Design a protein around this nucleic acid. Structure first.
Lengths: 103, 142, 48, 150, 110, 56, 117
RNA sequence: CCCGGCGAGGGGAGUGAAAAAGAACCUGAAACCGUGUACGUACAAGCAGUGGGAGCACGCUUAGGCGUGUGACUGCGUACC
RNA sequence: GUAACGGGGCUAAACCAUGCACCGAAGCUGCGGCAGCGACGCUUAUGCGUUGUUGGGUAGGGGAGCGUUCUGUAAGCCUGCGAAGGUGUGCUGUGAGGCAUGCUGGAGGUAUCAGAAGUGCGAAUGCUGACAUAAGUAACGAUAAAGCGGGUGAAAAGCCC
């Protein structure tokens, strides 16, 4: 059974069995993550929603890796005006593995 | 952030025969184009359109409304000779009845590449030279 | 034991700015100093 | 370079390029374009600063526990084997030797090392003084280094 | 046993040789050497002595037969050049460049 | 009249797809000649359909 | 001293030309055309980081729109029904089950139709 | 020892630590023309790149939209000084 | 050459009147990562905490750093037990750069830091070198042309006899 949840301002789609990527936790591997900020549970058919991020039912997960991303480069440039500059960024993350969704 | 992502796999067409029932030229027309994109239904594809396989077969089930009997844009010409040549709304029905509906969906086609990617899914095969009854597709009235 | 291996105060190791080489510059290119003039090209003084 | 008399111009504006003298420095061997200089750089330093540097460096050799007095830092002969076997026995090789006296009997001896140096105590210069592992001197040189510093 | 024949400093350019060379490319040695014998072209005569030479040492020396060989590689690259003075209008003394090409035949077993 | 930019190597190879060099496009196996039979042509010993007709 | 220009252009070449692999023609082998190619790229790459989001949103709205028009009222009346029932952050990327089975949020849409014309 | 003029040029055999030291021999780029493999091109097209990406070879697909290389198709989009 | 609603299309899908909705930018905002610097808290040789406007940028100002050739410590130490150089990928840092490593390589190399410089090319209708290009395009040198037989010769559409 498929479901949608909130991790931060990043919004997250998931099924049962799925590995998903989210915003940095202080949490490390070997711990359990859970989101009760689940907005609905649906399969082919989206339910009726009275309160925002319904408190009924859970998404159980566990951390499987906390690390830091590899280095992408961002180029800042403007023609004719002779402007050229360069930046890097990596960003941290936490990967979670969904161990089950309620019914 | 990470999850399922849009693809050329998530695509649905199937075969439709559009037998309209006296619908006015443009309320047929804009629906034929719309479905030839798939905007009558879900896309989820930032790339080539999902479309449907559309046969037009009705040909002559068109009517008019307004003074667009003669004023309508179908004007065309060539560098070969000078002037303008023309065709009327009544001309376009009176010979090859397909033609009015065909160049109603023509002008809705996007850019260069995508408007061609749509075109290869549409079929008329000339006014009154039809053979698509041999398939018997999913019927459609409008 | 060592020699010439001193990391001195902030004035003895001074370099100011160098802008002449590399494309990414602020006085290397675009004339000498400004555009379509004397200091902006070869010259800049004749008299004191 | 030569080109005082010659130009690859002789009127042009039709043709190719806006360069027109053969002695130009951007040619392979016409010269160099970064400007020109002498690459030795004589520099004296002011007298209280120089002498007050040599005071810094002498304090440093003391904070590091390197200064020695010994009887007989030199033999009586130019012969390398007599000095070189006396300093090896005394565990005193690889040293900055400051002599208070200077002659050929010390300067032509102890030559059996790659690390051995001789300077005079009334002229001990700050580039010798900061290098080498230990400074051995004798009691006479130690006298004369003070006199160089005052 | 495997053989290289070259002819370096050969009178043709490599763009001009590749024309004939792709006609015999991968045809097997014995068949390729016949179709080329009955071509009455001077470029085709030029490659021929180098094709025959590749095959001829393989059937000898450290081996036998021809039918066991195949033409595994055949290529041409731009070698040196000789410069010549072409006659032209108003005494213009423009260069015309005579490209010598380095011609390589490889025969091997399959 | 001239150009605008230096040609690419894709350009050169496509232009030759229909303008490269061609020969006699093989020959047949023999039956009657001293040489190998040139397809539907007489040999230099002459025997094709019969006798030494060619002698040069 | 003389400097023969070194092993610094050798290291800079290997960086640029590596980023410039999969590029057509002279844009992989000629450093000038490469340098140019690399700049056009890094401009494209930073623009489409955002610009992807703007494009995908059109689709996210349009899968909601078809599903809702079969199930009653249209898309904009449905977002305002949802604003009325449950506030929400008003999700457009709301479901992957909007792409297949055009029946979804049907209870919410009938509610919305009653709440606005 | 093989092809050829008596030639041009190379290979094989044998030498040496090394011939990816073979005589212009030092290790060796790039422009420069061709081969070999992978994958792509017959409904298709704009600074040729980015975004999404069928697919196919290879990776126990990390089973978890995925990795490497390439890329139908297509959103969007005007080189650098 | 349709080709001012941008176009299809529209005679109500228009225009006008009233009003509502939605969508719609690196903006507004939340999330994760970070910059410099003010105010306050612990309170320091060295730091860390709360909070804050803030970070589109050329000319131009002012500071700092990298590596390259060379040097100084290099007087030492590693080395065919694989040094310089060449090159594909992976990692890593804001970036210049740096490092791991397969292939290549058969002797040289080394910081940190300070000092010297012919110091990074892609541009100056630049100088020199190798060598590419429209192209298998254009050219066939008073058409004192040439035939065919025999031959030199490894070979003869043009040669010699």
């Amino acid at each position: 059974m498929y479901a949608v949840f909130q991790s931060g301002g990043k919004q997250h789609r998931v099924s049962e069995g799925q590995t998903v990527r989210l915003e940095k936790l202080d949490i490390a591997t070997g711990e359990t993550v859970e989101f009760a900020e689940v907005l609905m549970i649906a399969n082919g058919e989206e339910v009726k929603i009275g309160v925002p991020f319904v408190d009924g039912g859970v998404i159980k997960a566990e951390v499987v890796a906390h690390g830091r991303g590899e280095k992408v480069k961002i180029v800042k440039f403007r023609r004719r005006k002779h402007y050229r500059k360069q930046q890097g960024h990596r960003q941290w993350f936490t990967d979670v593995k969904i161990t089950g969704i309620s019914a | 952030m990470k999850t399922f992502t849009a693809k050329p796999e998530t695509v649905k067409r199937d075969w439709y025969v559009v037998d309209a029932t006296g619908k006015t030229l443009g309320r047929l027309a804009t629906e034929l184009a719309r479905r030839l994109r798939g905007k009558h239904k879900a896309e989820y594809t930032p790339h080539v359109d999902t479309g449907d396989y559309i046969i037009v077969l009705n040909a002559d089930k068109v009517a008019v409304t307004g003074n667009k009997r003669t004023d309508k844009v179908y004007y065309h010409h060539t560098g070969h000779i000078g002037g303008i040549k023309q065709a009327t709304f009544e001309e376009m029905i009176a010979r090859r009845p397909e033609r009015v509906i065909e160049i109603a969906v023509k002008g809705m086609l996007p850019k260069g590449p995508l408007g061609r990617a749509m075109f290869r899914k549409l079929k008329v095969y000339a006014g009154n030279e039809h053979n698509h009854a041999a398939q018997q597709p999913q019927v459609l009235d409008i | 034991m060592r020699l010439n291996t001193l990391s001195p105060a902030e004035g003895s190791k001074k370099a100011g700015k160098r802008l002449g080489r590399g494309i990414g510059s602020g006085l290397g290119k675009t004339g000498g100093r400004g555009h379509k003039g004397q200091k902006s090209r070869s010259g800049g003084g004749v008299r004191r | 370079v030569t080109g005082s008399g010659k130009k690859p111009w002789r009127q042009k504006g039709t043709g190719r390029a806006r360069s027109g003298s053969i002695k130009s420095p951007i040619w392979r061997s016409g010269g160099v374009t970064f400007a020109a200089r002498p690459q030795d750089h004589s520099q004296k330093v002011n007298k209280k600063m120089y002498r007050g540097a040599l005071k810094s460096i002498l304090s440093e050799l003391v904070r590091q526990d390197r200064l020695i007095v010994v009887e007989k830092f030199s033999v009586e002969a130019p012969k390398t084997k007599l000095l070189a076997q006396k300093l090896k026995d005394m565990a005193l090789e690889d040293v900055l030797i400051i002599t208070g006296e200077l002659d050929e009997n010390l300067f032509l001896a102890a030559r059996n090392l790659h690390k051995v140096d001789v300077r005079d105590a009334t002229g001990i210069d700050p580039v010798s003084l900061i290098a080498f592992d230990k400074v051995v001197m004798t009691a006479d040189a130690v006298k004369q280094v003070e006199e160089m510093l005052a | 046993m495997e053989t290289i024949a070259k002819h370096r400093h050969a009178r043709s350019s490599a763009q001009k040789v590749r024309l004939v060379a792709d006609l015999i490319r991968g045809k097997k040695v014995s068949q390729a050497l016949d179709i080329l014998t009955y071509t009455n072209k001077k470029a085709a005569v030029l490659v021929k002595k180098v094709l025959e030479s590749a095959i001829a040492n393989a059937e000898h020396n450290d081996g036998a037969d021809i039918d066991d060989l195949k033409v595994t590689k055949i290529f041409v690259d731009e070698g040196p050049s000789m410069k010549r003075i072409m006659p032209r209008a108003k005494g213009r003394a423009d260069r015309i460049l005579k490209r010598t090409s380095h011609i390589t035949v490889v025969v091997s077993d399959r | 009249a001239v150009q605008q930019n230096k040609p690419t190597r894709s350009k050169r190879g496509m232009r030759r797809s229909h303008d490269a060099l061609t020969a006699v496009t093989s020959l047949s196996v023999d039956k009657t000649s001293g040489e190998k039979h040139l397809r539907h042509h007489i040999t230099a010993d002459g025997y094709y359909r019969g006798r030494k007709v060619i002698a040069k | 001293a003389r400097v023969k220009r070194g092993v610094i252009a050798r290291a800079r070449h290997k960086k640029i030309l590596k980023q410039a692999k999969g590029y057509y023609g002279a844009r992989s082998r000629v450093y000038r055309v490469a340098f140019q190619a690399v700049i056009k790229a890094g401009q494209y790459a930073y623009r489409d980081r955002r610009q992807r989001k703007r494009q995908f949103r059109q689709l996210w709205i349009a899968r909601i729109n078809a599903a809702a028009r079969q199930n009653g009222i249209s898309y904009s009346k449905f977002i305002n029904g949802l604003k009325k029932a449950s506030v929400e952050i008003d999700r457009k990327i709301l479901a992957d089950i909007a792409v297949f089975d055009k029946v979804a949020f049907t209870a919410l849409v009938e509610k919305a139709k009653a709440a606005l014309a």
